[PDB]
Amino acid sequence: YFQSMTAYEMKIGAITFQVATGDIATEQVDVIVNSTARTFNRKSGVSRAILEGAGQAVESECAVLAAQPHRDFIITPGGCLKCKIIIHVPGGKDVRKTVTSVLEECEQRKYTSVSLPAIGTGNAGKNPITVADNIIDAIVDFSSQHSTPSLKTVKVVIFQPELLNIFYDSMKKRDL
Amino acid sequence: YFQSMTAYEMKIGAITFQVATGDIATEQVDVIVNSTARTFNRKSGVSRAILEGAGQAVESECAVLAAQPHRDFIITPGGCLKCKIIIHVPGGKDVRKTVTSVLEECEQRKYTSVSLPAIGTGNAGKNPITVADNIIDAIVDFSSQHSTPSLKTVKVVIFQPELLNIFYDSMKKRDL
Ligand SMILES: Nc1ncnc2c1ncn2[C@@H]1O[C@H](COP(=O)(O)OP(=O)(O)OC[C@H]2O[C@H](O)[C@H](O)[C@@H]2O)[C@@H](O)[C@H]1O
Ligand SMILES: Nc1ncnc2c1ncn2[C@@H]1O[C@H](COP(=O)(O)OP(=O)(O)OC[C@H]2O[C@H](O)[C@H](O)[C@@H]2O)[C@@H](O)[C@H]1O
């Protein structure tokens, strides 16, 4: 027997923003985000959960894309994950900028749902208050620039339950 | 354009407890709760939304059941609502007791989901802090008495957004 918060949701313009405890590998959405090394050669923390669930093909696709010229992120299909593409981002880079780019990729490909982890709050060592604020900053910016987007649902999947209430505190500063 | 909290969720034992802004008439669950007069002869506030959406048949069923002997509540089918039964409860009675009975009816009929309004916080004039606490008290009691229930999902649908954060405050006192 146990008692604890598991999810918070808010509406920001046309966008539903969700923060919930989970394993992002179980997600059934258009786009899943992987937070990884600059070189895309990591299989530990959230990258382990994603690369193992996605399968070997995705993993080999990553090694190809990594050794040829690329944006800050690379994109692969989902493999055995119940998603269409995976966007692999470096967890050490500016999170607001990373999430703004993720959201813009989603929109331009006409995807409707994206789930991401708490980027940078594991091995990257970034301060989790700042990371929640940055992710929220990026969603508010995107929403304020798009009054009728295809991307309607953004979720942060939280693995460390301790971060759930950090994310709530940052959400609540926006609430009316 | 606008920004606001819309949903909170927690786990209490085997039960998922959800509080979200909404019109309970749109709910697609096993059991919907109607908060009404002792005589079950009300069509105003949440009863209006429910009786209009359910249809005339449900409404006439209610008048029959009301004029013959009954428990504190009566039960009808859902009509045109996307639910199997409606449990009509008096919003002026002890809320903890009312919700304990609702939950016990759900379990014994092997239903899996129930949605209810903020019982008593409209025309009944009950204090909404106390009502949230009472509803939560009842869920914790039921959960602590049932380690493997059929009833797995309980939702409070909130129409007055102001009550959303009252419900959160009562939930957060249980969180670990
Ligand atoms: N299954 C999971 N589902 C969702 N989130 C998870 C899961 N597993 C762990 N997390 C959370 O995922 C969050 C991120 O933890 P990490 O996987 O270390 O990624 P990073 O972005 O910090 O660092 C990645 C690289 O980036 C930098 O360049 C550094 O060099 C790093 O090597 C944590 O909250 C985990 O608890
Ligand atoms: N569509 C809706 N969906 C969900 N909740 C709603 C909706 N519409 C209103 N509400 C909320 O429903 C909540 C309850 O408002 P009321 O329908 O007045 O029911 P009561 O239980 O207070 O009083 C019912 C009788 O009981 C006593 O005996 C008294 O005699 C009353 O006459 C409020 O928060 C509404 O905003």
- Helix proportion of chain A: 25-40%
SSE order of chain A, as H and E? EEEHHEEHEHEH
Number of helices of chain A: 5
* CA distance, first residue to last residue of chain A: 35 Å
Please identify the top-level CATH class of chain A: Alpha Beta
Largest beta-sheet details of chain A = 7 strands, mixed
As an assembly, this protein is homodimer
Strand content of chain A: 15-25%
CATH homology-level superfamily of chain A: Leucine Aminopeptidase, subunit E, domain 1
**What does the overall shape of chain A look like?**
globular
Number of strands of chain A: 7
Q: Strand order of the main beta sheet of chain A, please?
A: 1-2-7-6-3-5-4
- Which hetero ligands occur in this complex? ligand AR6
CATH topology descriptor of chain A: Leucine Aminopeptidase, subunit E, domain 1
Could you tell me the radius of gyration of chain A in angstroms? 15 Å
**Largest interface summary:** A-B, 25 and 25 residues
Which CATH architecture of chain A would you pick? 3-Layer(aba) Sandwich
Structural class of chain A: alpha/beta
Number of domains of chain A: 1
Keywords (chains A, B): Glycosyltransferase, NAD, Nucleotidyltransferase, Nucleus, Repeat, Transcription, Transcription regulation, Transferase
Organism (chains A, B): Homo sapiens
GO biological process, one term (chains A, B): protein poly-ADP-ribosylation
Family (chains A, B): Belongs to the ARTD/PARP family.
